[model samples]
Target: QDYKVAEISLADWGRKEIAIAETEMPGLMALREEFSAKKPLQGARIAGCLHMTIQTAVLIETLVALGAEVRWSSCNIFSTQDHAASAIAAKGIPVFAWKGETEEEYWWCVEQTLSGPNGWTPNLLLDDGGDLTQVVHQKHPKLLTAIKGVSEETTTGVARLYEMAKHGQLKIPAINVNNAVTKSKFDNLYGCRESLLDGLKRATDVMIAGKVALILGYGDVGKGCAQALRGQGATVLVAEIDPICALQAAMEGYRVVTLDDVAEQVDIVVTATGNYHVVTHDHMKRMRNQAILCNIGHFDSEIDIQSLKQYQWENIKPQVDHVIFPDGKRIIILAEGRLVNLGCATGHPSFVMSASFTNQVLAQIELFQNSSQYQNQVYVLPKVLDEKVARLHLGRIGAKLTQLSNEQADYIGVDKNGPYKPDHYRY
Candidate 1:
């Protein structure tokens, strides 16, 4: 199968592909309709560095419909949906990405998209993992003056932007779209819940029922995996460094144990910690024979793949490899312990990403409209925009929220729109 440039036939295939996205991405479509009249991002040049998928194609279309000149590239080496990339490219979006790029190709693709001869120095940036923003900062500090702001779409990106802000090096404002309620609540949780099941099923076809599954970290991603695994009748054990998260796992009816205690007993171990080496060589050595190991984290570092290379393992199954120890124990690793969802299966369904990308696009529009007021620092997606995206989602799902009556609002000293909970309330 061709993995490089998707041909013209693929562009025809992409039209049907984006139709599927349109059905699931109503919230984004609605945003497009609402903002069409005003063209809030009119005359803005947007450089988006994100996974090139059908859902992102919808986002690009929405940006174009609302009057922005956009350039895009895939954020990860293997995360591009070739048909979607072809479709967007066919539409003349100046795309510079494809699936299965080499390491050198990945950086080259990002630089080419950002520094294109169109002479379009971006006035706005949208990034998934901060690679594009970091590149622009390193290569073209002078470009910072024209940059209205940037919007980042993942936890890793947000963390990196925070570091840049702390050191007084961030010269333009940035919005943390990942932290928006519409994103974290539905996108991170529900998206990961279903996709994890799909990925594991596609890769190993292992029966989830009656298996002992050890999940590392109890953050939003881990919680989603644990819930879905338990729902499929797997015995779930959660290993977490955060006490509060560990306690939450216990309360949620899963066994909470340390990694070392459960390593030898679990049939499968999945890491979603977004940190480095939660599963080390020592832990891998103790895993049960035929135990499966994978990661759903933001990056591959969570599972220490380099250490596995050092140990000289070999592939036993198509996408599953076996590591043999001197004691004759064999541990099977899937997708080389990278993000199993993207590496093994299609990523989060486009419907879930609709909310995430909606927040992302809107954040860019908001930044452009309010550029004069924003300082050179990282920012959260405004609460109003967050609520708007939530309302759009709820509306799409046919969900109706209960509104307080005037008397009740008066008694509670709250407005009808709501302070339904405190600002820091976790949904």
Candidate 2:
């Protein structure tokens, strides 16, 4: 019964929103309908650390309906939609999250999810940005023995898990749900494509047309952001450390340049690179007056907001600020350089989130049901389940999938139901 949220009174409002999201999230709904009778997660205890949004509410309820005991927290300090947290908590789920938590409070909230009422210990983890995984390894080593596996929900978290494994610090098996085709391709690419504009429009209300914008990175996130900026009539520039991504940007008709070349010229700068400090103080100093800066990465370090703290600043509104330079020029920083889409606007559309969360639900089942099949390493969702996630959602759009004939299957040497692409197939 221990829970922390902004307001329990908002639960009714949040449940209404979750009901709407359920309609858009057919994949998770299908999984819920199909698996509720079996109760695959009957004895599984899941500690979840991801954005607490309405879409996530659907995911959490689906897990509960399938008989999992769950505790949850927000991955970012500001990404928790208070009503959503209230709704989940009203259902008697332990949700230690709220909007606008301090750094100390943030870690405290995450730690609360590790154990629960009646001395419950989590046997599985669902993490975004690896904070929960890092905390368990560093501060709660005693909890390791009970943990069967983890399902990581973001590229940033998956990368951190890989680093933990490289250092031989990771103990429990982890599934890289972020890398599943259904996740990376749809969530990062198409999700960002939709949410980028949502964030921009919500925060700035500035015209996209005629603004010169630079997207730093050309991974799936960057590609989607660049596409969104261009689609909105902004002249988009791209900066990429990877040659292949840089070439892909150029082939896609974007002007590829380093940040140094366009830092001063661009009117808006967005960091989609998941790496730290991609936008430094030097770049901030060179930005045009009134230039806008924001990050879509999981961590706020991507924009070096720490170094810019000495500058004079004023909040235009919640999650939007103008940091004044020594010469009195100003640059607007959105969401304190955190994930702008989640901070300034809703994270992603529920339909796109449905695919990603479906992968998460399946990964949780796989890790819990077959705990001994994995090792202390990272894994992707099996292709069969990945394709099944796609199949579950296709019915909503009324798009008919073409089935492969026996002759076509024989010629291709692949099953009709498919995993049609090779393991290394770049989509």
Candidate 3:
């Protein structure tokens, strides 16, 4: 079906960018080679609700390569990479998304992906941020009984799905690939590590060296950003709501302090904690003049942008906002408090996204093939399959994985072929 996008003429540009992304994302392309012969997903109908970008186009085509027919839409109203949308549309995939969308338009686009040409109902859901699942539950509950399952790709989406299951409202099995070992260990950690500074540099051109950066959260994304800042000579402070995370931050060589303690001292503040209003107007009032504020968490509400209503706002530059309080003291907010890595820069590098997206595609294949094995609840990619996803990408980087001898494996109690970490292992 011909779908909506910025321009159909941009389809050629989309194809070019996708070709570049393909070279860097060999793992998913490898899936195409390894699984196409088997046709494991033959005739499967999939509706993908995720960021519409060039890397995502690769994922869509990979699903097709594995024998799936897909209808796609952008999960966030503003995150569509226009050329990617055009490219997928050019390939004849039903993609209902554009660069900017009103809230109502976002829901309308999401609903359209549920039913394709000739009223085709997708048998599987690939979602981000749980928006697609919400639509299904709210508007088409009966469809849950028919689909294979939903495969989710964000911390927020997994949280929503878990909440649904906890309350007995969830009617379909959902794979929480967000917590997949490859995703948490590699994607969130290294991916953010590599992208944070790139995002900030592009957005404001602030020199990272000699700057005091405040990172809120000591979880994986926070750790990555903190380490990256330190590695580049920035003095980094980590603020955490959890004592354990605070302790970990201290051990990692960061000054663990409360936001209240350093709000006026740091030059830049990044909120990676998923909690709402982690950076409020009160905190902003105490921030240094010209302090840069941003969020890396899935949702933009992490920074209370609405609380800045008392201040005059000006778009100082692209993705940079200048807020003037009563005294003319001002601060800079990046990407309107959205995920700066994607909103300010080009998201993560293709190499990192490959592992994350591969987990997603594999989850899709697993859920469809093992439909009877899952119940109406959330699931993590089993450790075995998680390792499989990890192993596939090593060849692309030309990195060798060391294999343990039988005695060595027995001594550590991990199989040479791994689910290597134990159940209580902390990432």
lDDT (10s digit) by residue, model 2, range 193-249: 999889989999789999999999999899999999998899999999999999999
- What global local distance difference test value does model 1 have? 0.83
TM-score of each: 0.93, 0.99, 0.95
The order of the candidates by lDDT, greatest first, is 2, 3, 1
Hey, what RMSD does candidate 1 come out at?
2.6
TM-score of 2: 0.99
Which sections of candidate 3 miss by over 4 Å? 410-415
lDDT: worst 10-residue window of model 1: 1-10
Write candidate 3's Cα lDDT for 136-177 as tens digits. Answer: 998898888888899999888888998899999888889999
TM-score of 1: 0.93
Q: Which residue segments of model 1 deviate by more than 4 Å? A: 1-8, 310-330
Whole-model Cα lDDT of every candidate shown, in order: 0.83, 0.93, 0.87
Which is better, 1 or 3, measured by lDDT? 3
Q: How accurate is candidate 3 locally (lDDT)?
A: 0.87
Q: Which ranges in model 2 have alpha carbons more than 4 Å from their true place? A: none
Q: Write one digit per residue (lDDT tens) for candidate 1, span 124-154.
A: 9999888889988988888888888999998
* Colliding residue pairs in candidate 3: none
Report the error of model 3 at residue 129, Å: 1.7
